[PDB]
Amino acid sequence: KLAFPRELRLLTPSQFTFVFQQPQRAGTPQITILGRLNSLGHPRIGLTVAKKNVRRAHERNRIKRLTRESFRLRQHELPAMDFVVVAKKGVADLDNRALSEALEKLWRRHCR
RNA sequence: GAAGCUGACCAGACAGUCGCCGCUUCGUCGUCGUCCUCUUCGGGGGAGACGGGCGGAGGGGAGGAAAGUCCGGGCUCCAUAGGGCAGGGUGCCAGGUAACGCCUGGGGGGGAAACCCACGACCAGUGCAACAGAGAGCAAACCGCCGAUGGCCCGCGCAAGCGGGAUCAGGUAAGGGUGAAAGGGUGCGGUAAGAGCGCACCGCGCGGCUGGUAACAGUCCGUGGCACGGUAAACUCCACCCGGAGCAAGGCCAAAUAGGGGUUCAUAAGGUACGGCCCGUACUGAACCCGGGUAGGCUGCUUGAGCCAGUGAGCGAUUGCUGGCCUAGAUGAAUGACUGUCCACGACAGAACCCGGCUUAUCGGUCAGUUUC
RNA sequence: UCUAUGGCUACGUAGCUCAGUUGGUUAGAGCACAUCACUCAUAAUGAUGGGGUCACAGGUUCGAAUCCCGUCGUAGCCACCA
Ligand SMILES: [Ca+2]
Ligand SMILES: [Ca+2]
Ligand SMILES: [Ca+2]
Ligand SMILES: [Ca+2]
Ligand SMILES: [Ca+2]
Ligand SMILES: [Ca+2]
Ligand SMILES: [Ca+2]
Ligand SMILES: [Ca+2]
Ligand SMILES: [Ca+2]
Ligand SMILES: [Ca+2]
């Protein structure tokens, strides 16, 4: 069947800027999420892991894949909105379970 | 034959859901400027080149360094006839890939032979912080003193010159000596007793040789007596190599736009390129900056100067011949969770034009060798 | 507020801006604040603290901020048409 639908990701910088316009922000001192309303009917997610926040590329790939998996899992529940995630300094030392729970809590908060 | 140090490998693997990436293939939607065959187009057997157009089947996806440009190479457009520097690299020499700031045989050095080497030169230019130049360099009270022990009545020759002492001062004393690394010594009539100045030894310098394709060895004869001790990643010299730039090089397919200003121009050929300067080459306006968007599709992107097994060569790096093989290559950018096990309990770390290296991080183990009870 | 992977470019000395180049002295002014007659909570062309590992890891040298290779960090450029 169809693989991952590219219509659920932020590809061009235009969409990134559109989301960064005036989104609703929510996050912990580690990671934050900014969500805006769109007109496609399905939600979208974006990733933003800078090199200064995380130097090791393996950790960047790990966090990106974890966020994508969490989004794919909680896709039918989240509201039709485009989200963008941003990491900070102090997230590489977090474990998989703790980071997954934090992302789940952030998504539950963004649900409103 | 209880414990180190090199060396190749693994460092996470096996099975089950919810998910990413692509390749081949089965059934379909279509374009075809190939049309085989029906081809009067309100169609149809269509064979195939193709496409986020689709529903299934198979086998696969972190590397051991994908981490850093620190090197060389395949390709590419930018663009060049030849002579010279400047600034860059290779440097014990020899062999192999196309080669290298790659690997290996041999020699040499380094106090661990106890296992390393960024190891050419200086008998043309420069320096070498002594604070007494005695680490380019000439001698300082300080002991020495050979030259008459220049002389200086202290004794006498108060009558030819002699004894002593030191005159410590007016003489080079380069011989040990204290002053951060110091012109070779072990011993000698070693002058009136200081220095190869003279005598036996040399790892000190020049030429010859018997080993050896060379690097350099040498306990071998035959002399001249000394004419650098370093740093040469300190200037400089030699044997070879130097246009450089990167796949966000560029090569195609369409899709919305050389239209705009100042830098100066008979045949002086004044501007450009080979250069960063110079002889030379033949070709015509030149870069500072002002105008527009796309974020589209294909390649380089995964078939390598590789892999398996045998026959050879090379005392080794490496390479002649056979049978054969390849399931990631992307584009905000693929690896996750719950369970049964492993003990190798799972550290570092991630691919992106590519290949062969170089530097470093690299929890713990597998073995094949090397020092000590 | 943005942003990897790849090529090239410039550096890392008082908290901030700034120059020095084995010259052996082993190193320098201003901006944050106090002190001398501190003249209106600027004093002026003055001095007194300077609580700088000259970012980290090495090397020929007697010795290195300076010379050669290395690690980390920050900052900048890389899609074309007529
Ligand atoms: Ca396997
Ligand atoms: Ca590789
Ligand atoms: Ca010389
Ligand atoms: Ca000489
Ligand atoms: Ca002597
Ligand atoms: Ca002499
Ligand atoms: Ca271009
Ligand atoms: Ca591609
Ligand atoms: Ca990408
Ligand atoms: Ca990488």
Residue numbers in the entry: 1 to 112
Give the original sentences from the paper that presented this experimental model.
Bacterial RNase P consists of a ~400 nucleotide P RNA and a single protein (rnpA, ~120 amino acids). In bacterial RNase P the 3′ RCCA of ptRNA pairs with a loop or internal bulge in the C-domain (L15), while a conserved adenosine in the catalytic core contacts an optimal U(−1) flanking the cleavage site 5′ to N(1).
To better understand how unwinding occurs and delineate the structural basis for such plasticity, we used cryo-electron microscopy (cryoEM) single particle analysis (SPA) to determine the structures of holoenzyme and ES* complexes formed with ptRNA_GG and ptRNA_AU. Only a small percentage of ptRNA_AU dissociates during the entire time course. In both ptRNA_AU and ptRNA_GG bound complexes, the 5′ leader is positioned with the correct phosphodiester bond placed in the active site, while the 3′ RCCA is trapped in the L15 internal bulge loop of RNase P. When a smaller nucleobase occupies the N(−1) position of the leader sequence, as in the case of the ptRNA_AU-bound substrate, it forms a parallel stacking interaction with G1-C73 base pair of ptRNA and A248 of RNase P. The N(−2) position of the ptRNA leader stacks with A333 of RNase P in both the ptRNA_AU and ptRNA_GG complexes. At the U(−5), only map features for the phosphodiester backbone are observed in both AU_ES* and GG_ES* cryoEM maps. Notably, the distribution of the three classes identifies a significantly larger proportion of ptRNA-bound RNase P for the ptRNA_AU (~80% ES* complex) over ptRNA_GG (~46% ES* complex) dataset.
